């Protein structure tokens, strides 16, 4: 064939973290929320099978699986950690997923709450016709 193709999609990873007015009965001092979305409320669900948040093993049911948007997790905690996030694609051929190590950090009391955003671009070179159609429907 004479044609080649490169499709590029943008994802926004991010988290919010606030010091609680009163710690939970467990001692947890913060409420946080972490998420994967697309920009402009894009419909990434067209090409995203599921999003998996790998919480620290200290949390109950550490493998949090989101098969349908919003792709997010809301918890309380007391300490920052690295949170591996895996985005699975509605694809049959490589790549079938992409992994990002998300820095879930928390700020001390007396400092402002955390609102963090991290932009990531994914580039698919010569996707199949059906993966390509889903990618571009987003």
């Amino acid at each position: 064939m004479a044609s080649s193709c490169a499709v590029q999609v943008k994802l926004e990873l991010g988290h919010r973290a606030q010091v609680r007015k009163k710690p939970t009965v467990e001692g947890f001092t913060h409420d946080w929320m972490v998420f994967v979305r697309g920009p402009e409320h894009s419909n990434i669900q067209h090409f995203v099978e599921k999003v998996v948040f790998h919480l620290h093993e200290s949390f109950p049911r550490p493998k949090r699986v989101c098969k349908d948007p919003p792709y997010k997790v809301e918890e309380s905690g007391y300490a920052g950690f690295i949170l591996p996030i895996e985005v699975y694609f509605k694809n049959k051929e490589e790549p079938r997923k992409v992994r990002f190590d998300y820095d879930l950090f928390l700020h001390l009391e007396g400092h402002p709450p955390v609102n963090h955003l991290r932009c990531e671009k994914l580039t698919f070179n010569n996707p199949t016709e059906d993966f390509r159609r889903k990618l571009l429907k987003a």
Binding site: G80, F105, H107
Partner: peptide, 8 residues
């Protein structure tokens, strides 16, 4: 630091 302690 502005951050809390961390876990691994």
């Amino acid at each position: 630091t502005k951050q809390t302690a961390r876990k691994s």
